[PDB]
Amino acid sequence: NECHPERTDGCQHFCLPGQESYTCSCAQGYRLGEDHKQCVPHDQCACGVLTSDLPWQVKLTNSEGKDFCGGVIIRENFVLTTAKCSLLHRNITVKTYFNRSQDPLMIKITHVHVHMRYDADAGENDLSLLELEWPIQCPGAGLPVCTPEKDFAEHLLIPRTRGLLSGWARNLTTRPVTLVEGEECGQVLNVTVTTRTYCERSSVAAMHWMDGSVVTREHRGSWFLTGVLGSQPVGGQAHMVLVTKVSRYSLWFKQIMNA
Amino acid sequence: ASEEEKAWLMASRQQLAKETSNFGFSLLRKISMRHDGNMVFSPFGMSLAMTGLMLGATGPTETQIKRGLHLQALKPTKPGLLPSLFKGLRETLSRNLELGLTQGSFAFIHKDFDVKETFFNLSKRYFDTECVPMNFRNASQAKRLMNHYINKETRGKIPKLFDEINPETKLILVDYILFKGKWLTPFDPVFTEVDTFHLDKYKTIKVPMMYGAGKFASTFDKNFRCHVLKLPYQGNATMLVVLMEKMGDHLALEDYLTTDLVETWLRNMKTRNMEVFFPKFKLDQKYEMHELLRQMGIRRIFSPFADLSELSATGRNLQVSRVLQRTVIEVDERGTEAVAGILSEITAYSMPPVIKVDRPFHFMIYEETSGMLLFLGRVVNPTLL
Numbered sequence: 005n006e007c008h009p010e011r012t013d014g015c016q017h018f019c020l021p022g023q024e025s026y027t028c029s030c031a032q033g034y035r036l037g038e039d040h041k042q043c044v045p046h047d048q049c050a051c052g053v054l055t056s057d058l059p060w061q062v063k064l065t066n067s068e069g070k071d072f073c074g075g076v077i078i079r080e081n082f083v084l085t086t087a088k089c090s091l092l093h094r095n096i097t098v099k100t101y102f103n104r105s106q107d108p109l110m111i112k113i114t115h116v117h118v119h120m121r122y123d124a125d126a127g128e129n130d131l132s133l134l135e136l137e138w139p140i141q142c143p144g145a146g147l148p149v150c151t152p153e154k155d156f157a158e159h160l161l162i163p164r165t166r167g168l169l170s171g172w173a174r175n176l177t178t179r180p181v182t183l184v185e186g187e188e189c190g191q192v193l194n195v196t197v198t199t200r201t202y203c204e205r206s207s208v209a210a211m212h213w214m215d216g217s218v219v220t221r222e223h224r225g226s227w228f229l230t231g232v233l234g235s236q237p238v239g240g241q242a243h244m245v246l247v248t249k250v251s252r253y254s255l256w257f258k259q260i261m262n263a
Numbered sequence: 264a265s266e267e268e269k270a271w272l273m274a275s276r277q278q279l280a281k282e283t284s285n286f287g288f289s290l291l292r293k294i295s296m297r298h299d300g301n302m303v304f305s306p307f308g309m310s311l312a313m314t315g316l317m318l319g320a321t322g323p324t325e326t327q328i329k330r331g332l333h334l335q336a337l338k339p340t341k342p343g344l345l346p347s348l349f350k351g352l353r354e355t356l357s358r359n360l361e362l363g364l365t366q367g368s369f370a371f372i373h374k375d376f377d378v379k380e381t382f383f384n385l386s387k388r389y390f391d392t393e394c395v396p397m398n399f400r401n402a403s404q405a406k407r408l409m410n411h412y413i414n415k416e417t418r419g420k421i422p423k424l425f426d427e428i429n430p431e432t433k434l435i436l437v438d439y440i441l442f443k444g445k446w447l448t449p450f451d452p453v454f455t456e457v458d459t460f461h462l463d464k465y466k467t468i469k470v471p472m473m474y475g476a477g478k479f480a481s482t483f484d485k486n487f488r489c490h491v492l493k494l495p496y497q498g499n500a501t502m503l504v505v506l507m508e509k510m511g512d513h514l515a516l517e518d519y520l521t522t523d524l525v526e527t528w529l530r531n532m533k534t535r536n537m538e539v540f541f542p543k544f545k546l547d548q549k550y551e552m553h554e555l556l557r558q559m560g561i562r563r564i565f566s567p568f569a570d571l572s573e574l575s576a577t578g579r580n581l582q583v584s585r586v587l588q589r590t591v592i593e594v595d596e597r598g599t600e601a602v603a604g605i606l607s608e609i610t611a612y613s614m615p616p617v618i619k620v621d622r623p624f625h626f627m628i629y630e631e632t633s634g635m636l637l638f639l640g641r642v643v644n645p646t647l648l
């Protein structure tokens with residue numbers, strides 16, 4: 005009846021306790037199996053699937069042709085990036101190299117949704133969702149990364165599994181990262197870590213990555229988004245990274261992306 | 264007061280309540296940036312206390328407070344009509360013997376500053392804020408003395424509010440509020456039992472769970488996926504309990520909490536005979552509010568550039584150093600002797616409706632006539648404070 009985080013024999017993706025049993029549920033575009041535990045890819049845009057650059061990574065490009073930020077696909081017709089990024093230029097174009105060299109796919113952004121509680125001064129809720137004029141053709145043109153439900157992310161992914169911080173060189177480059185608790189990280193970065201941000205230890209400075217880069221974590225054959233990289237303290241030269249805690253924005257994603 | 268002035272006062276009561284609850288929801292979102300756990304404070308108590316500081320403030324120091332509390336739309340013929348608004352409302356809360364509320368505030372002011380008696384008397388008479396001169400340079404004595412005052416007024420329920428005092432301190436504002444109410448329909452302690460409570464989807468704990476049967480008002484927001492349940496108190500006050508559907512994030516709703524949303528819930532309420540399972544709990548929370556208030560645009564008064572020269576002429580250099588609120592709320596079975604309502608029979612295809620509060624929830628305690636939000640809170644674990 006309880007969801008066992010210690011074990012591997014329960015749900016593949018998300019779990020929900022109660023009664024004298026537990027109801028499993030799946031990530032975006034996955035069917036719940038006949039055994040009521042496994043999640044099988046159903047739709048064409050089954051999230052977080054890799055193979056053997058990254059299906060969900062995209063660059064943000066301006067009218068002059070200059071790339072300025074990174075972003076990650078989270079739905080068929082939606083890219084997530086920081087608010088700062090989305091407000092730098094009036095006309096932004098998303099582009100991706102996935103399954104293309106000198107011929108990247110360009111897609112115009114029809115609408116920009118800055119978080120309703122974004123505050124530039126404090127730097128709180130620094131995200132925006134960009135609606136694409138035309139949907140991505142899954143899986144060939146691209147794929148969205150999975151967005152995890154809150155408890156799953158904060159008890160199964162982040163504290164237990166090693167992560168990957170991937171993005172574009174500030175001036176695709178991927179490195180492993182691991183969790184550091186707020187008390188320590190605050191003192192290293194000389195800031196106060198909020199409940200909607202958290203820290204990753206990195207073997208390289210934060211300025212290595214562009215704003216809009218992301219931290220991801222694999223789980224039972226699927227990649228989940230756990231962090232977005234935005235404004236870094238102390239110049240972004242510290243070997244810790246402050247990322248936005250994506251697990252806290254699940255309701256906002258639904259409210260916006262379901263129209 | 265005059266005829267048109269009395270008109271203004273009562274007319275402005277609704278507006279004051281609406282704005283103070285939006286002030287409350289805004290402050291909730293600030294507190295949530297630093298705290299995930301149990302949470303309770305008083306929007307009314309904060310607005311009352313901060314409005315008291317306007318008596319001495321002039322210029323932007325004053326104006327920012329008024330905007331920060333969402334009160335700028337109120338335009339009184341005499342400046343003193345805004346304090347009289349607060350005086351009327353807090354006295355009505357006091358007069359309610361039935362309401363088990365204790366509230367007060369202190370302004371601890373460094374002994375260098377000659378506090379003008381106009382501020383001294385008006386702060387007490389309108390806001391019941393007691394101005395008490397303090398020698399902060401002897402920090403350990405100031406701590407003992409300040410803690411004595413709060414000890415006295417709370418009758419020992421808050422025996423040591425202060426742990427540390429900066430000897431550089433200029434002014435400390437303290438607001439305290441303690442509440443334990445009596446339900447209009449009580450829970451029967453014979454049916455209070457130890458049930459499971461989901462701290463989250465991967466963590467359970469055992470808690471005392473109260474059981475209530477009878478007519479209750481409730482509704483279900485189909486957009487945000489949450490149940491809203493009214494638990495009325497004796498003394499013309501009500502707790503709204505907001506329970507998110509099982510797979511949802513209670514913290515996520517806080518970004519959408521507005522006076523308008525609450526009003527939409529309230530007029531969509533339907534009353535029916537049902538069963539309510541609700542945990543006993545006690546919360547005791549203190550916050551350093553000045554940094555949170557800074558983020559809501561109340562800034563100049565917490566800076567060396569503050570103008571509280573009306574509050575005192577003496578110099579170098581009157582500002583507010585800290586603003587504290589400590590809030591104590593307790594919930595148990597006790598209520599007035601109501602006759603128990605009949606539930607509908609259990610048949611082969613149905614049984615009475617049920618709301619089971621066995622996971623984290625928000626609550627709001629409102630005064631009914633005014634709509635003033637006395638307490639705004641969140642319980643994530645009812646076995647701790």
Ligand SMILES: *[C@@H]1O[C@H](CO)[C@@H](O)[C@H](O)[C@H]1NC(C)=O
Binds near residue numbers: 103144145
């Ligand atoms: C690349 O896209 C083409 C054209 O849509 C598709 O047929 C193919 O499966 C994709 N190849 C890889 C390796 O992703």
Ligand SMILES: [Cl-]
Binds near residue numbers: 552
């Ligand atoms: Cl605090």
